[PDB]
């Protein structure tokens, strides 16, 4: 299938009460493997999947030294952006940063990502060609000109298409026994007595990995969009996922609907009735 | 592994 490595960084000003909170996490596909928290006592990058513990003490030293540099860089970013928008030293504010790479089935380079947000709105983002920027507003155009003059994108491109992909491959093969494993959803349907006349059919899918899934309802003929709802895929807490889909139906007509579950943990999809 | 170089906004 296809795979991604992504890092996420969040910096929050806590004005007067210390200097900003910094939180970093790394994911391979839908499995988190590292974290760094500037508030935690260890002051280290820490493992969060077991297969990353195959990495030696130099991995850890490096990652910790690099993530601390990230930490100060976005601390400085917070002071800078407060200028570019003329804000106040009481206001708490947020810088968000995300980057990483995607690879295809052949495990070769597909796509790369590098983008920022300020207070939850896009600031600047590297375009898919990995050569040009997308600045949301003029303030980011200021960053854009500086990043263009100092040729940020070209060095980014060497990491995203190269180093980033090299790590992902290594991670995928190191943690093969979990990361490359398929978990099929464990399906079951549920019936409720909503306004007497009416019944709710809830189709469940549980303990699957990855989180990607499709849950389609249907009648004797095709899909049933109206009167359906679809939950946000949620985490089980053990690295697997869950998601349900409901419909309201006329009493006595229940057993005529079929849920359809698509996932790569199953050869053929599964169908459910009540 | 994360980026080895950092750069300000």
């Amino acid at each position, epitope marked *: 299938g296809s795979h991604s490595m992504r890092y996420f960084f969040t910096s929050v000003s806590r004005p007067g009460r210390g200097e900003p909170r910094f939180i970093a996490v790394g994911y391979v596909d839908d499995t988190q493997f590292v974290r760094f928290d500037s508030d935690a006592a260890s002051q280290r990058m820490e493992p969060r999947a077991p297969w990353i513990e195959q990495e030696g003490p130099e991995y850890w030293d490096g990652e910790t030294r690099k993530v601390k540099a990230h930490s100060q*860089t976005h601390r*400085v970013d917070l002071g800078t952006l407060r200028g570019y928008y003329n804000q106040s030293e009481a206001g708490s504010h947020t810088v968000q940063r995300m980057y990483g790479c995607d690879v295809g089935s052949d495990w070769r380079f597909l796509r790369g990502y590098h983008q920022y947000a300020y207070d939850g709105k896009d600031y600047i983002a590297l375009k898919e060609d990995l050569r040009s920027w997308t600045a949301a507003d003029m303030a980011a155009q200021t960053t854009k000109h500086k990043w263009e003059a100092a*040729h940020v994108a*070209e*060095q980014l491109r*060497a990491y995203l298409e190269g180093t980033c992909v090299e790590w992902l491959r290594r991670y995928l093969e190191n943690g093969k026994e979990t990361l490359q494993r398929t978990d099929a959803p464990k399906t079951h349907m549920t019936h409720h007595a909503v306004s007497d006349h009416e019944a709710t059919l809830r189709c469940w899918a549980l303990s699957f990995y990855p989180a990607e899934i499709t849950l389609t309802w249907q009648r004797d003929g095709e899909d049933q969009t109206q009167d359906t709802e679809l939950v946000e895929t949620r985490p089980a807490g053990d690295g697997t996922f869950q998601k349900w889909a409901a419909v309201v139906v006329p009493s006595g007509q229940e057993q005529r609907y079929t849920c359809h579950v698509q996932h790569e943990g199953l050869p053929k999809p599964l169908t459910l009735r009540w | 592994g994360i980026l080895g*170089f950092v*750069f300000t906004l």
Partner: T-cell receptor
Framework: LLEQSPQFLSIQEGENLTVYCNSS?????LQWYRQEPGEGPVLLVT?????EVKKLKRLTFQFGDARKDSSLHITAAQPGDTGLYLC?????????????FGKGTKLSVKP | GITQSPKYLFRKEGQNVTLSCEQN?????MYWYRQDPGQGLRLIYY???????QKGDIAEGYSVSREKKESFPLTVTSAQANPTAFYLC???????????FGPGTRLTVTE
């Protein structure tokens, strides 16, 4: 890795010379400097786009396609062009925040 | 520009000395090198961003700090075995891009 070539080059005026800078890796940017001993190196140019060509008076810098090499050309050499010429750069694949420096090509233009 | 004071520094062995390096180019990254006669630059320490720094290829005996964006002080302690050399500071707008050098400081140590 970063090697400069040749270590030394003697040229009587008016001739043209071309010194080189090469890497077993790939540069995300490459700098050329002049350095006088006992003073700080002086920045001539930065190149970034593979294949690109930049001119600075009599000097012409070129960047290889795969950004693995670079060259400095002096057309119509002068006795003021004498000195050590130093190549530096960022190694893309290295994922680091530092530049690498060469040992410098030393050029002597005879008056 | 980037300043280095003083241009000359003389000390007896054992005496810690701090070299200064200031810049108002609005650069985030700063770098220290030393150079022995007839040789090339050797990275001692560098800082990609205020409140961060990291060892170069020859950090033993040396110490730095980066409390302020503008300044990157270098201390040569009695742990460094061969401290006598030419010391060069450089800065770049972001780490791993074109560096601009300071004028350099000569340090001689005698027993």
């Amino acid at each position: 890795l970063l090697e400069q070539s040749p270590q030394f080059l003697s040229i009587q005026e008016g001739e043209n010379l071309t010194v080189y800078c090469n890497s077993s890796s790939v540069f995300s940017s490459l700098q050329w400097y002049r350095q006088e001993p006992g003073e700080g190196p002086v920045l001539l140019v930065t190149v970034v786009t593979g294949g690109e060509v930049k001119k600075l008076k009599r000097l012409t810098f070129q960047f290889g396609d795969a950004r693995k090499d670079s060259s400095l050309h002096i057309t119509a050499a002068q006795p003021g062009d004498t000195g050590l010429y130093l190549c530096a750069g960022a190694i893309g694949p290295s994922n680091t925040g530092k530049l690498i420096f060469g040992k410098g090509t030393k050029l002597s233009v005879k008056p | 520009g980037i300043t280095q004071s003083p241009k000359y520094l003389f000390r007896k062995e054992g005496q810690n000395v701090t070299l200064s390096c200031e810049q108002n180019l609005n650069h985030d990254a700063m770098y220290w090198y030393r150079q022995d006669p007839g040789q090339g630059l050797r990275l001692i320490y560098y800082s990609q961003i205020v409140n961060d720094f990291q060892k170069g290829d020859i950090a033993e005996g040396y110490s730095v700090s980066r409390e302020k964006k503008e300044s990157f002080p270098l201390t040569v302690t009695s742990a460094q075995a061969n401290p006598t050399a030419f010391y060069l500071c450089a800065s770049s707008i972001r780490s791993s891009y074109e560096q601009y050098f300071g004028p350099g400081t000569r340090l001689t140590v005698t027993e």
